[PDB]
Amino acid sequence: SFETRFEKMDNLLRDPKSEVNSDCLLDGLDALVYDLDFPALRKNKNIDNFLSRYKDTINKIRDLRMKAEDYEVVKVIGRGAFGEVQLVRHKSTRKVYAMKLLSKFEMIKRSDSAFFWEERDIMAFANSPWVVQLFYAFQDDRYLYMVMEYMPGGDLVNLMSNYDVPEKWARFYTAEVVLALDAIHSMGFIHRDVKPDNMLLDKSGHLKLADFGPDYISPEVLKSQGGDGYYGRECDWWSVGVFLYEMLVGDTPFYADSLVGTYSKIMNHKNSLTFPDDNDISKEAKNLICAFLTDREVRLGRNGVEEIKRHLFFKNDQWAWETLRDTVAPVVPDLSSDIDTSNFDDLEETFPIPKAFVGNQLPFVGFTYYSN
Amino acid sequence: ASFETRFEKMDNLLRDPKSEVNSDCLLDGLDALVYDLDFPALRKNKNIDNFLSRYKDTINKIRDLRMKAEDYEVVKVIGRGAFGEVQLVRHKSTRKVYAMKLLSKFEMIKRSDSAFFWEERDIMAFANSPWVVQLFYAFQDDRYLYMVMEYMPGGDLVNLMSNYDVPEKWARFYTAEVVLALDAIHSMGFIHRDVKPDNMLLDKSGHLKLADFGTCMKMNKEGMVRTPDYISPEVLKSQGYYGRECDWWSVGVFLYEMLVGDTPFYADSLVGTYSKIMNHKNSLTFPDDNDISKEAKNLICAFLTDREVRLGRNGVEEIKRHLFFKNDQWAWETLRDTVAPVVPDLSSDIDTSNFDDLEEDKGEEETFPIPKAFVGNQLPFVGFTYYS
Ligand SMILES: CN(CC(=O)N1CC=C(c2c[nH]c3ncccc23)CC1)c1ccccc1
Ligand SMILES: CN(CC(=O)N1CC=C(c2c[nH]c3ncccc23)CC1)c1ccccc1
């Protein structure tokens, strides 16, 4: 059938989850112009003629497509190894967002340029109240850009520093992390390193997970990094136990001065896991921490989220699992302005000119995403 | 500007068939990149090897979904050229017969000639004229460019002129259809540069259409462009700047050959022909024993004259008003409705009686050397794909 094959082709060209969608195919042409336009390369007739034929329209497309210049940087609200997070405002729409930038130079230099694909897909397609949304994803020759919802409530590292977390609060945050992880697991993904930095609080003080691509890592994720083991969803449930312990105790359960010491304490969890002498912690809170901080064969979460939800630590009279997001969060942030950075602490290299085709833009083809 | 205006202008560039960057040209770029990068020496670059792993699967899936040579069943080879051949083909699924023109990418790259086909592709795809051979689909693989066009079973006008003594009544019909065909091409901004009976094909009802635009060049904002019997004097002076009227000279040669039986500037030697063309004011003569009207002689002389005063240099309207076209069978708006002088008798949708059936070759699949660095041999063909 000719029209069935022609229809299937249009499906691939218009589906946002397709690698050959219209905005993805445009990335290939854009990358090709960035990577070919060098004097040594343009000596090749095929290259010089192709660029003459497409540099007018590619420069035109670069202007029409979303670009960094469409955003007004307000402040830098975060920083990482490969870039930074900026609170930005779209010039035309005036809407504020959080934009994550990833340096193509650093990524290529460190030979690490494929870690962002699952983060892009989870945030773009989750469609969940528990996952930070990615509205747009674009790029230029130097950076990858991720336009996400701004989470003014800050992160849980900040919350834990500013407050003495009572059990009533710890139960709320732990339950929201349980629902957030279940939404991610339902999509077919495993977070791997769930930590308080990945837990962001929206305008109403409710939690959403962000940042998909040592203290919080499970024993199986450590073992499997030596190229022989394997792990399941229960590796994220281990992280929940570490988070609950840090919240009620003030320290990570396997803290050590050295990275080796932490790694070793995690493997020796049956002997290193201890609750300080001066612990006001309930028996149900300790039960839940121990049920998560154990080997994967007997870990809570092995037989789904239901056994986690039924734990006595979650028994309370303020909320229910099915309506938890409608309840008032323990810390509802001060909604002063759309530019409020109160909950956040405040704080370039060009590629060498190629003498042959290097293709530095190739590992980024297909990153562009427009939610419409 | 407006944001939604930017994202609407984008969707226009992505849908417009005449756009350099519609979704077919964009898939061409990705398909060209997978061909040009999938070599073991290039796969040593991590960026290249990783990109190919990420897209090899979908590019092969897309190659199957998109139109390909295997969708067509070859029936005969009805024509041949330096860079390829023309095959009478039948679509496997639809069973409809077409004429497919193939152009060898190796012969093209090897001879450093890989940009002549763009005008032919655009004329046949966008002319939208009852007088220009239509291009339904255009596709490609790593070895060939393919052009799926309407099959013209009636043959060409060289064949028609050999088999018949063309009366004026017939010559007027064929000249009239060539005038409408050249005007469609001129309206698009092109100059044929090689109008001869070889380019004029007859369809299943005997109606004429132009084909063979390998020689086509696009005019500038002032209408200028950069066999020997059909060539105008302005070209022989260079052999520069040529207007529309260099095509109208060939119409005059065509009309003379039709009514007389010989080309107006025939000679044993090429030099004798070139000399006769330059001396057109004295060499152009009509045989004493003729059934040529004063209006046919007027039209031929109006075309076979200096480009500074030639009929056509200011449009087709003055040509259409010529008294030679006055007749009682048809009008310019009723020409294609008329019964053509020679309506071909066809046994089947596959009948090739009006063509010299040719022997297929199926032997030269020559190789470009395996790239040790990025060569980009598929780059001059990005954007050739067309679907109607
Ligand atoms: C600091 N990171 C971590 C990260 O990947 N993320 C941290 C949290 C995000 C966020 C979403 N919405 C936000 N709203 C207010 C502040 C941060 C955010 C996005 C994800 C980072 C790492 C490497 C290179 C660059 C940045
Ligand atoms: C013979 N040339 C000219 C050519 O390009 N064309 C001549 C013939 C065509 C045709 C359309 N429809 C047809 N139907 C019945 C016969 C021929 C046709 C189309 C155009 C050629 C040159 C190089 C490589 C290959 C062929």
Residue numbers in the entry:
A (entry chain B): 6 to 218, 238 to 371, 378 to 402
B (entry chain A): 5 to 230, 237 to 249, 253 to 401
Give the authors' words.
The second structurally characterized inhibitor, Compound 22, and its analogs, contain a tetrahydropyridine linking group, which were not found in our survey of PDB kinase inhibitor structures. The three azaindole inhibitors have a distinctive tetrahydropyridine ring linking the putative hinge-binding group with the atoms that interact with the P-loop. The structures were solved and refined to a final resolution of 2.34 Å (Compound 1) and 2.74 Å (Compound 22). Analogously for Compound 22, the azaindole nitrogen atoms involved in hydrogen bond interactions to the kinase hinge are only 0.4 or 1.0 Å displaced between the experimental and docked poses. In this case, the displacement between the two molecules becomes larger as one moves distally to the hinge towards the back portion of the pocket underneath the P loop. For example, the carbonyl group on the docked ligand that interacts with the tip of the conserved kinase N lobe lysine 105 is displaced 1.8 Å from the experimental structure and the respective distal phenyl groups underneath the P loop are 3.4 Å apart. However, it is critical to note that the protein itself demonstrates shifts of similar size in our alignment, such that we observe displacements between our experimental structure and that used as a template in the docking procedure of 2.1 Å at the zeta nitrogen of Lys105 and 2.4 Å for equivalent backbone C-alphas (Phe87) at the P loop turn, or a 4.2 Å difference at the outer tip of that phenylalanine 87 sidechain. These observations suggest that the bulk of the observed ligand displacement is due to the malleability and differences in the protein component that the docking algorithms would not be expected to achieve. For instance, ROCK1’s helix C is partially unwound in the mid-section affording greater plasticity and this directly abuts the P loop and outer portions of the binding pocket. It is again reassuring that given those large adjustments in the protein, the ligand binding conformation itself is quite well matched between the two models, albeit with this tilted trajectory differential.
We apply this method to identify inhibitors of ROCK1 from almost one billion commercially available compounds. To facilitate further validation of the method and confirm the postulated binding modes, we obtained co-crystal structures of ROCK1 in complex with Compound 1, the most potent inhibitor identified in the virtual screening campaign, and with Compound 22, an inhibitor we considered structurally unique. The crystals contained four monomers of the ROCK1 kinase domain in the asymmetric unit, of which chains A, B, and C were relatively well defined, while the fourth copy of chain D was quite poorly ordered and not used in analyses. Focusing on the chain A example in each structure, the resulting electron density shows a clear binding mode for each ligand.
